[PDB]
Every structure is written in C-alpha cells, then in structure tokens.
C-alpha cells in the first residue's frame, strides 16, 4: 500500500513524476487516487476517462448512482467514492475549466480538498483541456496542499517544463 517510487521531490510534501496516473495506481495501490472530474461525474476523456476505463466502467456506474441521489458537485468541490481496483478510494475533484469561463481562483478550493487525506496520488488540476496555466496550477498545489501529494503528469515535455520552472 502507498509504495510510491521514481518521484522528484519538489517540497517536503509535494512530489512529481512523468507517468500515467492509471499505471501509477496499479503499481502503488494508493489509499486515495484523485480524479480530475467534472460536476456531473461524466468520465468521457482525459484523466477521468482513463481511470474509468481501467475500472471496466464500474466507476461510471457508481458515479451515475451518486449524482442521482446527491446532485452535481460544485466547481472547487469534491466527493469520495470507491477506488475500485485502482485504490481504496477515489477523490473526485472539480477544478475550474477556464476554457468555459470558470474562475481560476477556484483552483485553490479544488486543491484544498486534498488536505482531508494524509497521502494521495493525483493529477495536475485544471491542466489539459481545462485551460489553466500548468505552472500556475503547480504553484497553487505547493502553496495550498499540506498533506503528502504525489503528482503523476502524463507528458514528459510538461514534466520537464514544470520542474525547470520550479527550480528557477
Ligand atoms: C496535463 C495532462 C497531461 C494531464 N493528463 C494526464 N495526467 C496523468 N495521467 C493521465 C493523464 C491522461 C491519462 N492519464 C491532465 C491533467 C488534468 C486534466 C486533464 C489532463 S483532462 O482530463 C481534463 C482536465 O484535468
């Protein structure tokens, strides 16, 4: 459980690796994996589609049942559901989609959800098609999360850019 290996240490609680979060979850068996979710928990692509496919759609069926009873999440919010075969729990976190006009200041609320868990495997929030500047997302993570977070970024070019920028 929680056997993280091959990460670069950015701060005493923030680590980063060039890796697919699904492959890390299979290797590590973390207590918590974070999903880069949307408010209706529709796992149609990106991190969410990869995690759901690796559960053979069990995550989508569970998420639809959660939304039917509880309604959608808010941007900046989260919920804890099963991790299925990938982790004990999946923390579904909604970062702002600035390509759809959502407020970038909600990225701090999004990362604050990680503080409820002592250790997590997570993606870089609001990056990719959500449109936030990834260097800014990493700075928000480092300034907001106080628990131990292991970031898997599935792109070597982005990984090297983020490390270079943080070592300036
Ligand atoms: C930046 C990009 C490379 C990253 N993708 C991944 N990171 C880690 N493991 C992964 C991926 C894809 C498959 N497996 C990512 C980060 C947040 C993010 C997205 C995508 S999009 O899903 C939607 C909005 O949030």
From Swiss-Prot:
Known function: Responsible for the cleavages located at the N-terminus of the replicase polyprotein. Participates together with nsp4 in the assembly of virally-induced cytoplasmic double-membrane vesicles necessary for viral replication. Antagonizes innate immune induction of type I interferon by blocking the phosphorylation, dimerization and subsequent nuclear translocation of host IRF3. Also prevents host NF-kappa-B signaling. In addition, PL-PRO possesses a deubiquitinating/deISGylating activity and processes both 'Lys-48'- and 'Lys-63'-linked polyubiquitin chains from cellular substrates.
Protein's membrane topology: Multi-pass membrane protein
Classification of source organism: Viruses, Riboviria, Orthornavirae, Pisuviricota, Pisoniviricetes
Complex formation: May form homohexamers. Interacts with N protein.
Protein name: Papain-like protease nsp3
Effect of residue 164 to L: In strain: Gamma/P.1
Notes on activation and inhibition: Inhibited in vitro by GRL-0617.
Subcellular localization: Host endoplasmic reticulum membrane
The organism's place on the tree of life at top rank: Viruses
Residue span(s) of domain Macro: 1-168
Catalytic activities: Thiol-dependent hydrolysis of ester, thioester, amide, peptide and isopeptide bonds formed by the C-terminal Gly of ubiquitin (a 76-residue protein attached to proteins as an intracellular targeting signal)
